[PDB]
């Protein structure tokens, strides 16, 4: 009973957070095995951020310039390299708390948990989605740049995001753990605008199935639609087009509820056209799009 | 930048979760020092839940009937006692991962994080509030009954909730860690209804201050009000009456934004009377009441 925006338990990731300082810049790092990963802008002063030449700025840096502290104990840096927009600092000690892990590059629409940190210390955990414009709507302040996003499959942590930047509009940009930015963003103090933040249709449908499973059924209509008809309405409302791959992934939710995917599409089409009329679904007055179909199954089945 | 429903990092609590089984009933327990705390209904069969006499059912139970497993290793039970609606199982081993902790009984309107668990294993973490009717709107399934709610002050975990029950309406009830239910609920399979779930006014005001700090300012009006005038409108909209104690706690947010508390009350009064007109505040189409003034300060300042 009930449906919440739920994050993964963060303990396995808390055990990896470290503080990285270079000169007067401090941010967070992720310590896995004998490597600490952190945004490469740790080498920059605020002046350097205007137009940084990272390869050039890195020539002035040695292993001993990167101060890495895990808890209140200093780690010895024995190597450093730049991979895209991240630095990899080789330390002389493997993190004893390194969980089983993978580095994954997620697609827009995928959700993940963020462990927001400051000075290598966790402040909180929340659930995010990679937006269709490749920004995330997080909660980050100056100093949060070490922070990572991740998913867990039983005991394996798949790290998918490292936070680098806030856009002038207050939305967030970052990279995967190979240092490649999501979207077209660059790690420079230059104005960068985000594209259309469309609604993740397959996730809204998943959340309407979660609503039916939890008893919120008022929005179920007497209609059906087709993918093409639904998509004409999705386009008009800045929703992502729905494909047969999305219909396929919704199959288990359709099976569990007995509501055909296209019938749920027709109920969504009526909600878009009629609005909520002051009503709520799962305590929300808007259509929630940051639960994937897998998230709904996981939460509704009690996966640990 | 950004404002999210954020939970506390859960690692310190994950280190305390255990599985407790008695007969054919399995739920979660909280292992702190050499004591495991769990709902007393672990001793009941589904038939026993209709009208349980817990003292009588406990006479048929010995230490060896309580099976406690931490990870995949069994703990030896050397004592057991009932305190209100919880059992305290004394084990022969202190939990090596016991954090600094306190047991606190929270007031309605207070928020906390929940680490939802099944079979002593964490499934996820989310943020809750103790509702004014002493229910919580969680996300819990059968088997989640060990699960706890907590707050953290730097390194000390204050446990405030243990989950026991879902009401026929799908809202949740539980106890503090001394086993006293919040509200009038009893641990029995008998229909129990909840009272009015009013809106936590001081938390909505805190969230409107978070919205102004994060750039969402459209709702700021040219008016002010008084506590008595505001409360006439709060009563009409099923909002909790605002007191001078609530105004006092909002002082830091008023100081940080330069918006007098009563002016923010007048902006809230207009939102109640006019509605949102299809607009959003912090990505919500309703007024959010599960952030306390302390939560807003903590999140907006990056407390770790
Ligand atoms: O955005 C930055 C610093 C920065 C400036 C320019 C480029 C880069 Cl890569 C980083 N810090 C921050 C503040 C608030 C929330 N998230 C991040
Ligand atoms: O409510 C119960 C079992 C129960 C029945 C009657 C009394 C008591 Cl104390 C417990 N389990 C559950 C299921 C879904 C969500 N939260 C809890």
Swiss-Prot record, chains A, B:
Where found, per UniProt? Host cytoplasm; Host Golgi apparatus; Host nucleus
Peptidase C30 domain location is: 1-304
Residues forming coiled coils? none
Catalysed transformations (reactions):
TSAVLQ-|-SGFRK-NH2 and SGVTFQ-|-GKFKK the two peptides corresponding to the two self-cleavage sites of the SARS 3C-like proteinase are the two most reactive peptide substrates. The enzyme exhibits a strong preference for substrates containing Gln at P1 position and Leu at P2 position
Signal peptide annotation: none
Cross-link type Glycyl lysine isopeptide (Lys-Gly) (interchain with G-Cter in ubiquitin), placed at 5, 90
Would you say which domain of life the source belongs to?
Answer: Viruses
Which residue intervals are topologically Cytoplasmic?
Answer: 1-304
**Catalytic residues as annotated in Swiss-Prot or TrEMBL:** 41 (for 3cl-pro activity), 145 (nucleophile)
The UniProt-reported impact of residue 142 to A is: Does not affect ability to cleave and inactivate human TRMT1
Q: What activity regulation does UniProt give?
A: Inhibited by pyridone-containing alpha-ketoamides compounds 13a and 13b. In turn, alpha-ketoamide 13b (tert-butyl (1-((S)-1-(((S)-4-(benzylamino)-3,4-dioxo-1-((S)-2-oxopyrrolidin-3-yl)butan-2-yl)amino)-3-cyclopropyl-1-oxopropan-2-yl)-2-oxo-1,2-dihydropyridin-3-yl)carbamate) inhibits SARS-CoV-2 replication in human lung cells. Inhibited ex vivo by michael acceptor inhibitor N3. Inhibited ex vivo by compound 11a and 11b.
Q: How does it assemble?
A: 3CL-PRO exists as monomer and homodimer. Only the homodimer shows catalytic activity. Interacts with host FBXO22; this interaction promotes the proteasomal degradation of nsp5.
What does the UniProt record say this protein does?
A: Cleaves the C-terminus of replicase polyprotein at 11 sites. Recognizes substrates containing the core sequence [ILMVF]-Q-|-[SGACN]. Cleaves and inactivates human TRMT1, preventing tRNA guanine(26)-dimethylation of tRNAs. May cleave human NLRP1 in lung epithelial cells, thereby activating the NLRP1 inflammasome pathway. May cleave human GSDMD, triggering alternative GSDME-mediated epithelial cell death upon activation of the NLRP1 inflammasome, which may enhance the release interleukins 1B, 6, 16 and 18. Also able to bind an ADP-ribose-1''-phosphate (ADRP).
Q: What protein name does the entry list?
A: 3C-like proteinase nsp5
Which residues of the full-length protein are shown here?
3264 to 3567 of 7096
């Amino acid at each position: 009973s009930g449906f919440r925006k739920m994050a993964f338990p963060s303990g396995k990731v808390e055990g990896c957070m470290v503080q990285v300082t270079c000169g007067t810049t401090t941010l967070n790092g992720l310590w896995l095995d004998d490597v600490v990963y952190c945004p490469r802008h740790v080498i920059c002063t605020s002046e350097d951020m205007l137009n940084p030449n990272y390869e050039d700025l890195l020539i002035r840096k040695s292993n001993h310039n990167f101060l890495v502290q895990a808890g209140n104990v200093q780690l010895r840096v024995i190597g450093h390299s730049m991979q895209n927009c991240v630095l990899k600092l080789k330390v002389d000690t493997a993190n004893p708390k390194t969980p089983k892990y993978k580095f994954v590059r997620i697609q827009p629409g995928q959700t993940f948990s963020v462990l927001a940190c400051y000075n290598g210390s966790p402040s909180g955990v929340y659930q995010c989605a990679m937006r269709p414009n490749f920004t995330i709507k997080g909660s980050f302040l100056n100093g949060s740049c070490g922070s990572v996003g991740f998913n867990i499959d039983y005991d394996c942590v798949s790290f998918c995001y490292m936070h680098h930047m806030e856009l002038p509009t207050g939305v967030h940009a970052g990279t995967d753990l190979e240092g490649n930015f999501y979207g077209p963003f660059v790690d420079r103090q230059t104005a960068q605008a985000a594209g259309t933040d469309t609604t993740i249709t397959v996730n809204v449908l998943a959340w309407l199935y979660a609503a039916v499973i939890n008893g919120d059924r008022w929005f179920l209509n007497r209609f059906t639609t087709t993918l093409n008809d639904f998509n004409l309405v999705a386009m008009k409302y800045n929703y992502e087009p729905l494909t047969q791959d999305h219909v396929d992934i919704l199959g288990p939710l359709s099976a569990q509820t007995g509501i055909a995917v296209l019938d749920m599409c027709a109920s969504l089409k009526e909600l878009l056209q009629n609005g909520m009329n002051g009503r709520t679904i799962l305590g929300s007055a808007l259509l929630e799009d940051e639960f994937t179909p897998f998230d709904v199954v996981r939460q509704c089945s009690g996966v640990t």
